[PDB]
Structures are given as structure tokens and as C-alpha cells.
């Protein structure tokens, strides 16, 4: 079925204009339906921003009409949203969706932070048991990701192969930088023998880190 994917800057400075792109696949945006932009604020409340129909007609929320513009490119099958004069209040997760009175298809969403601060990459440190763990059966390994801005960071284990037993705590903001930890619990007869690595990605800074978890000795 139809697939939607948002793309755009993860960080924009106040007063600047915000431009997001939604790429649609497996469905022509000229065929039927309304193509919408909806955002979700940090508090999780949702706000419909507007749409562009298959015929090219646009419709905007009242509250944004004066500063918003939605356009499309029928040859690339993409539609766009431009929001002028952004303020810190425009920080939110932006989604494109297909629908009229209901929205059955949503993109994955792209987080946009409006701030004057600069991007700062993660430092990733391994979390290895103090060895003084004579519990055999289960072993818990981890990766500490700290000092980054803005959100978000993606953490995967073994390229994504290891998805069971993964616990990633929520990010925390201190002073002006985020920190997060991801932990994985694996069978004791799997780590000392097999390699475990955490994959950390920080889109804003185009940073991709790889960390091998080496045994304690």
C-alpha cells in the first residue's frame, strides 16, 4: 500500500523558515485523496496544519494560514510544507498523512527543534559488567550516549539483529545537552563467545558511531 516519508532539517533557528518534504511511494498524489501535514507537540497534543488535494487545492488551519504554504511536485510525487518565522513554540514532530475525515496512513514523523544552540554529536561509552557478576544465566551489556543536541538519537544492537531484551531509557536534559542509556540482556552463553555492538546515529550532526562491547579483564 501507500508509504509516506518525511524529510527535513532537524534543527532550525528562530525567525527562519521551515521547509519539510514528504515523499510518497506506491500511490500517485494526483489520483485521489487529500495530502496532509499534522504536528505533535512535546506534550503530545496534535494539530492539523493543512492539506493539498489531488486536484491541487489547498486548505489551511486558520491559525497558521498567514505563515504557511503547502505545495507539490507531481513529477517526483512529493508535497511540501513551508512555515515562515518559526519560534520555539513550533518545536514538534511533523507528520505527513493521507486522508479526508480520518487518517489511515501516516509517515514515520520527523522531529524539528527550533533553537539557537548548535548541533553537538554524542559521546558513546560502553557499559560492561564489573566482572564480579557470578549470575551466569543472564548478562546485561549497554551503551551510554551523552552530551548530544538536539534530539533524537537512534540506538540499535547488532545492526538490528538483537531486538529482544532491549531496554532504552528516555532521554534526559541537563543544562543543555541530552543523555540516554540503552541496555540489552543476552544469554550468558552468547556474549563471551559472540560479538555485541551498539549502533548509534545522530541525524542532526550526520554522525554514525559503532561501539564493540569488549569483555571485562
Amino acid at each position: 500500500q501507500v508509504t509516506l516519508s518525511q524529510s527535513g532539517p532537524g534543527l532550525v533557528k528562530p525567525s527562519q523558515s521551515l521547509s519539510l518534504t514528504c515523499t510518497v511511494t506506491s500511490y500517485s498524489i494526483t489520483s485521489d485523496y487529500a495530502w496532509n501535514w499534522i504536528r505533535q507537540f512535546a506534550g503530545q497534543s496534535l494539530e492539523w496544519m493543512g492539506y493539498i488535494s489531488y486536484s491541487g487545492s489547498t486548505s489551511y488551519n486558520p491559525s497558521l494560514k498567514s505563515r504557511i504554504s503547502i505545495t507539490r511536485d507531481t513529477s517526483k510525487n512529493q508535497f511540501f510544507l513551508q512555515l515562515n518565522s518559526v519560534t520555539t513554540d513550533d518545536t514538534a514532530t511533523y507528520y505527513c498523512a493521507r486522508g479526508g475525515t480520518g487518517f489511515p496512513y501516516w509517515g514515520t514523523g520527523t522531529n524539528v527543534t527550533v533553537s539557537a544552540a548548535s548541533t553537538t554529536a554524542p559521546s558513546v561509552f560502553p557499559l560492561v559488567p564489573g566482572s564480579a557478576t557470578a549470575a551466569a544465566s543472564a548478562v546485561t551489556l549497554g551503551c551510554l550516549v551523552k552530551g548530544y543536541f538536539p534530539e533524537p538519537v537512534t540506538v540499535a544492537w547488532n545492526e538490528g539483529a538483537l531486538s529482544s531484551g532491549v531496554l532504552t531509557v528516555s532521554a534526559v536534559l541537563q543544562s543543555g545537552l541530552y543523555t540516554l542509556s540503552s541496555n540489552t540482556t543476552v544469554a550468558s552463553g552468547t556474549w563471551p563467545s559472540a560479538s555485541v555492538t551498539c549502533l548509534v546515529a545522530h541525524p542532526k550532526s550526520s554522525t554514525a558511531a559503532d561501539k564493540k562491547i569488549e569483555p571485562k579483564d
Binding site: 486558520p62 489511515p104 560492561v128 564489573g130 564480579a132 540482556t185
Partner: protein, 214 residues
């Protein structure tokens, strides 16, 4: 603008119980109400549209009812994977608006946490810092208190605590407590202790490591 108000702001129920979520409109919205489910780290998913129509692929346990200004979403028998935020939205009048959501959490048997402590990595020490991490895994209820001791003395400054969302299979929580110090400070002491107090045990669960061996 029509305002949609979702009743229970938060709710906890056990697997197999029936749950009802409420959504009220400030003015008539006919039957143009839709319900969405948003699981942790995912985009919203359409469950019901037209007040009572189940969308394709949605499990039969979800049903909707209502008209005018009073709507309800019913889960016949909640499942552990139903943990999520639920929103109603109306499309009767322009602009389209959504309610603020109802968070559904799962109730389950009490479970004591498993504790793990991690000394700082040599890589961090090179930068002049030292983070000691205490991880509490698979427990319930969510409420837990962590205390840090350095060479037997309580330390409250430089501690950061954070929780994971509830697990979609076992409904348990996990949390990490991070104590951050400078390398010099870390190297002047030997014993680092993490003490956790949870309702499951009268005495705190302690985990410690000695730098002169780890």
C-alpha cells in the same frame, strides 16, 4: 474550533479486563469521530472511523459507539500489547481537531528488580569524566528509589534517573541511575554502591563494586 475532551487522562487495567475510553465534543460532530492508537516510538494508527466503523486489519476487541457529543472506544479484553496513548479526533467541522489523549497502562503482579552496576569505561576517563551506572531491570510497580554511596558516604549531587516505557510483553519497567564525577574524584575512592528500595522487599537491594579490582 470544536474542542475534544478525553475523560480518563490516565488509566491502569489488567490483561483480560474490558476498558472504556471517553471522548466528548464541545458541540455537535455528528458521527465524524475517529480513534487513533499511538504506541511508544511510533506514529498514530487509525482504529475506528465514522464513530463505529472498524478500520481494515484492526482486531475485533476494539469497537466504537456514540453520536453528537458523547463518544466511547471499548476494548473488550485488553492485551499487554494494547499499552499506548489513545486519541479521538473530529472531522465534522473545519478545522479538524483532536483530543489530548488517554494513556492506557497495564497492571500486573509485583516483581522485584534485578540490579546491575557498571564502572566507567577507560574511554571516558581519558576525557576527564567518570559515569557510574546502576541499572534496575524488569520490575513492577514503577515506583522505586535509588541511593548512591561512595566509600560508605551518601552522594546526592550529580545523579540522573530515567525510566523506560512499560514493556509490551511482560508489562515491567526498567530504569537507570547515573552518577557522574570527574576522573580525579572517581580515583580518590574505592567503593561505589547502588541501593534500591522497592515495595517488593523490606530491605534495600544493594549492588556494589570496588575500584581496586574493577
Amino acid at each position: 474550533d470544536i474542542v475534544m475532551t478525553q475523560s480518563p487522562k490516565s488509566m491502569g487495567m489488567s490483561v483480560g479486563e474490558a476498558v472504556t475510553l471517553n471522548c466528548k465534543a464541545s458541540e455537535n460532530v455528528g458521527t465524524y469521530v475517529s480513534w487513533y492508537q499511538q504506541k511508544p516510538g511510533q506514529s498514530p494508527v487509525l482504529l475506528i472511523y465514522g464513530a463505529s466503523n472498524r478500520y481494515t486489519g484492526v482486531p475485533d476487541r476494539f469497537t466504537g459507539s456514540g453520536s453528537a457529543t458523547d463518544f466511547t472506544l471499548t476494548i473488550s479484553s485488553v492485551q499487554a500489547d494494547d499499552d499506548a496513548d489513545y486519541y479521538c479526533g473530529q472531522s465534522y467541522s473545519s478545522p479538524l481537531t483532536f483530543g489530548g489523549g488517554t494513556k492506557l497502562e497495564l497492571k500486573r503482579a509485583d516483581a522485584a528488580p534485578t540490579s546491575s552496576i557498571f564502572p566507567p569505561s577507560s574511554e571516558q576517563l581519558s576525557s576527564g569524566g567518570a559515569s557510574v551506572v546502576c541499572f534496575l531491570n524488569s520490575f513492577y510497580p514503577k515506583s522505586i528509589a535509588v541511593k548512591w554511596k561512595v566509600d560508605g558516604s551518601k552522594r546526592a549531587n550529580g545523579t540522573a534517573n530515567s525510566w523506560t516505557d512499560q514493556d509490551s510483553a511482560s508489562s515491567t519497567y526498567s530504569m537507570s541511575s547515573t552518577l557522574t564525577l570527574t576522573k580525579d574524584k572517581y580515583e580518590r575512592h574505592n567503593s561505589y554502591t547502588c541501593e534500591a528500595t522497592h515495595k517488593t522487599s523490606s530491605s534495600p537491594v544493594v549492588k556494589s563494586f570496588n575500584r581496586n579490582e574493577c
